Design an enzyme around this catalytic site. Structure first.
Site, short mmCIF file in Angstrom:
data_model
loop_
_atom_site.label_atom_id
_atom_site.label_comp_id
_atom_site.label_asym_id
_atom_site.label_seq_id
_atom_site.Cartn_x
_atom_site.Cartn_y
_atom_site.Cartn_z
N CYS A 105 0.80 -1.23 0.00
CA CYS A 105 0.00 0.00 0.00
C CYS A 105 0.83 1.28 0.00
O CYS A 105 1.61 1.54 0.92
CB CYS A 105 -0.95 0.04 1.20
N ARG B 14 -0.23 4.66 2.72
CA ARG B 14 -0.10 4.51 4.17
C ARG B 14 0.20 5.75 5.02
O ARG B 14 0.24 5.65 6.24
CB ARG B 14 0.92 3.42 4.50
N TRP C 230 -9.07 5.81 -1.18
CA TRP C 230 -9.47 6.46 -2.42
C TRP C 230 -8.51 6.02 -3.52
O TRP C 230 -7.50 5.39 -3.25
CB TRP C 230 -9.53 7.99 -2.30
N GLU D 218 -4.33 3.37 -11.34
CA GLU D 218 -5.08 2.13 -11.20
C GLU D 218 -6.12 2.03 -12.32
O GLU D 218 -6.30 0.97 -12.93
CB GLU D 218 -5.81 2.08 -9.85
#
Ligand code: HEM
Ligand code: HEM
Ligand SMILES: NC1=N[C@H](COc2ccc3c(c2)CNCC3)COc2ccsc21
Ligand SMILES: NC1=N[C@H](COc2ccc3c(c2)CNCC3)COc2ccsc21
Ligand SMILES: C[C@H](O)[C@H](O)[C@@H]1CNc2nc(N)[nH]c(=O)c2N1
Ligand SMILES: C[C@H](O)[C@H](O)[C@@H]1CNc2nc(N)[nH]c(=O)c2N1
Lengths: 421, 421
Positions: A118, A121, A290, A295
């Site tokens: 991730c 973070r 979000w 992506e």
């Protein structure tokens, strides 16, 4: 003592000691590295058929409790000692234990903080927690999930949230979301043999259909929620359309971009992972944050096995789509990334570009080493799918390990489920 | 039995068995992965002060010989057996052995074939070998190297070649090229405090200067060859300018691009690695292939710690260089990559774009699994520095291991050298 880590963009050195708290084995062997493996066993926590052995549970429970009380700026040894005893007794009398909402909140954030893959973070302490550990039926799961979606979407002003369903008991009464993400589009193989929608969800779409869901044969049909409550067979629930906020794709210059008829949803939410903490396992705990522009612009739209729109955009821009060396693909994906960002921005929906996210993660990683001498990081997932070395994360050496609490993958539910009928 | 590997772009599965032939340990531990570490010990073969123990050498020698004769389509057991005996005897009588030119040629190609970080390996069998194992002085090293550069450059029609100097004997008479690459630009810190040239070679440039080299304070001054022969102190040799082919950077549309006054050399050649084969070690064996556009356009020109021209190009294109979300960096690097390719092409100098190279590697990897059930690959190095997921290599799972023959890194020579004066 510590593993030396270097950033070749700044020359800065960091000392990692946190890896000492790493768990069991992890992907890579000794003579070989398996770093690029998407779903290695080291990141997967499978199903059980018996409660967790007390010899294993107790130690982990104690460890977590110590971590929880250790996190306070102003210690509370009395509470700490009291809790330690209460947990033990509960384990002896019930063969397991319940976390306080407070400990649960702490665990979900730490697990996030411990997610190696991730990049967002730096937001780890900003997470709304929905306690659904008293959930009992699929219908209730559905209601909790709708409430989560509504809260998180917040009309475009996205908020990070996680919903925790009942923890695994004997492993025969698992709560599970068969979906991969809360919101995802269907994929269908048409009569003419072409694929419509998200090609990557062809099988899962067929499954929903097999379970009674009515296929709509559209390019962007939101898949239904397939919910398994208390170990029982999954039930299909269509997501109320009002809860699904979408963004129509437009380009700030190319008027023909909208002509592509593309759009995407605003809410990225993991539905199939498992939360592990203090010996406990939560097979159902959907969470969201979000989107990062790439992506959608890069993976969803440009992966050949997804919407595969790259070539079409190439022609629209009138590029030499027949000559790789022209780097037309690079020019196309950039305009698509611009479209995605431009659209979310115009429709007031939270989103972050990969450049801003990379710098953000760098600040986070530095905060972490300062805070606890380490930051589990998976370079392969942290480096954006485009403009790699242009981002600072690319030049940062990282150590990837599995701490606890942690979010694990699980075996596809339809592979191990024992159908009742 | 075999490690399962998957390509998520095609869904294709591959079975890796070649990793069984992997050597000792490799980077990653057990509880932690160190995959993103640039110079891990597992990829480094340091200095010695004593010959290689015969108990170790003999086994490796036998293994290599078996691999060599095993590579023939039509076996030759008699030669194979004869060679096995001859090598043993040589080892007993001399405490080491010499490879035949044929075995050396085989070893350099296999080592290349075994380079996990090389994306151009489909060319592995196309390598010219220069045997300089009889070299004795620095002057001779210099001559051999000039001959290598001339041959490889071939007026723009680049040819892959490798020059092998004497193998390590006792470790006190090592032949070493103190440079990192045969051709590299100097970097200087000017009186006004600014950096001129390749900021990454500031220290090495100072070293060359300390050794007597005359600094030219230019932006693209070709560094001199620092050659260490037979364990003796390094001697500085300026590379004859006629041997250095360069390409002036131009953009097919932006006439102002040439105004940037940029250029780069045509020949990418590793000068500081070590060739390991059958127990032998070659501390000096420079090799070259040709460039992949991104190395120059992205790393050399856009790394902040290198020429750092990204922002300047941004302004020239009149982009919102003050707003990351504008993705101006993505647009800038693309035009720079186009400039590099356009320029090499216009000046008839071999070069390959990262898209074409990725597909090329995919074909290679598939040939390899078919040929020997495996292909050591380092995803982190194989995925281009830009447009990652746009390349097929990004969706290919890979296993990274160390076979033999192999090309290792070495400890910086100035850190372990014992100066004679
Ligand atoms: C606040 C905004 C956040 C952003 C911008 C962000 C962004 C990302 C991105 C870009 C990925 C890559 C996903 C992919 O490549 O498929 C990722 C992965 C991940 N994120 Fe975050 N994230 C955020 C919040 C969170 C939260 C709230 C949690 C959990 C509480 C979380 C947990 C994870 C996990 C476990 C992964 C791995 C997913 C997988 O393995 O498929 N993230 N995130
Ligand atoms: C024929 C053309 C070739 C191309 C296009 C090619 C391309 C590349 C590229 C793009 C890299 C990345 C370098 C970096 O990021 O700094 C690389 C690495 C590498 N290549 Fe190749 N290569 C070729 C030929 C060869 C040959 C002839 C050898 C050896 C005989 C070789 C050995 C290696 C090794 C060992 C590495 C790792 C270098 C390091 O660790 O710094 N390559 N190559
Ligand atoms: N920003 C995020 N991205 C992902 C989850 O969202 C999705 C949505 C759709 C798809 C995927 C992931 C995976 N590829 C196929 C389609 C990973 O996890 C999280 C967690 C919090 S924010 C967040
Ligand atoms: N195409 C290649 N690229 C590299 C070597 O060339 C260079 C040149 C300059 C610089 C580097 C590498 C490393 N970054 C700093 C500057 C890696 O090795 C080989 C081997 C055969 S072709 C080849
Ligand atoms: C094979 C490879 O591991 C897989 O393609 C990759 C690399 N990195 C990724 N990085 C992210 N963030 N998300 C991903 O899906 C993948 N997949
Ligand atoms: C920290 C990281 O390992 C280093 O930046 C990277 C990643 N991959 C690379 N890939 C290549 N081909 N060459 C490189 O220099 C690097 N460096």
């Amino acid at each position: 003592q510590y593993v030396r880590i270097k950033n070749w963009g700044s020359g800065e050195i960091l000392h990692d000691t946190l890896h000492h708290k790493a768990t069991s084995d992890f992907t890579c062997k000794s003579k070989s590295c398996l770093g690029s493996i998407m779903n290695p066993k080291s990141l997967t926590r499978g199903p059980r058929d018996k409660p967790t052995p007390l010899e294993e549970l107790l130690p982990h429970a104690i460890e977590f409790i110590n971590q929880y009380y250790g996190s306070f700026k102003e210690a509370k040894i009395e509470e700490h000692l009291a809790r330690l005893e209460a947990v033990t007794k509960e384990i002896e009398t019930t063969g397991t234990y319940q976390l306080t909402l407070d400990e649960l909140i702490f665990a979900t954030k730490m697990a996030w903080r411990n997610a190696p893959r991730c990049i967002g973070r730096i937001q780890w302490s900003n997470l709304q927690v929905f306690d659904a550990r008293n959930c009992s039926t699929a219908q209730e799961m559905f209601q909790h999930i709708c409430r989560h979606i509504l809260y998180a979407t917040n009309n475009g002003n996205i908020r990070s949230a996680i919903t925790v369903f009942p923890q695994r008991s004997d492993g025969k009464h698992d709560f599970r979301l068969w979906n991969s993400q809360l919101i995802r589009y269907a994929g269908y193989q048409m009569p003419d043999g072409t694929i419509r929608g998200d090609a990557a969800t062809l099988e899962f779409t067929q499954l929903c259909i097999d379970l009674g869901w009515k296929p709509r044969y559209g390019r962007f049909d939101v898949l239904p929620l397939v919910l398994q409550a208390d170990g029982q067979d999954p039930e299909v629930f269509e997501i109320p359309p009002d809860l699904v906020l979408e963004v129509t794709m437009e380009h700030p210059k190319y008027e023909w971009f909208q002509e592509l008829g593309l759009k995407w949803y605003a809410l990225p939410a993991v539905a199939n992972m498992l939360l592990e903490v203090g010996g406990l396992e939560f097979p159902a705990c959907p969470f969201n944050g979000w989107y990062m522009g790439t992506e959608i612009g890069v993976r969803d739209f440009c992966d050949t096995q997804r919407y595969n729109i790259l070539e079409e955009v190439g022609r629209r821009m009138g590029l030499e789509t027949h000559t790789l060396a022209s780097l037309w693909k690079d020019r196309a994906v950039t305009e698509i990334n611009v479209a995605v960002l431009h659209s979310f921005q115009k429709q007031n929906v939270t989103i972050m570009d990969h450049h801003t996210a990379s710098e953000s993660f760098m600040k986070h990683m530095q905060n972490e080493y300062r805070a606890r001498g380490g930051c589990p990081a998976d370079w392969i997932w942290l480096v954006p799918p485009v403009s790699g070395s242009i981002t600072p994360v690319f030049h940062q050496e990282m150590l990837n390990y599995v701490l606890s609490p942690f979010y694990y993958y699980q075996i596809e539910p339809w592979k191990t489920h024992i159908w009742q009928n």
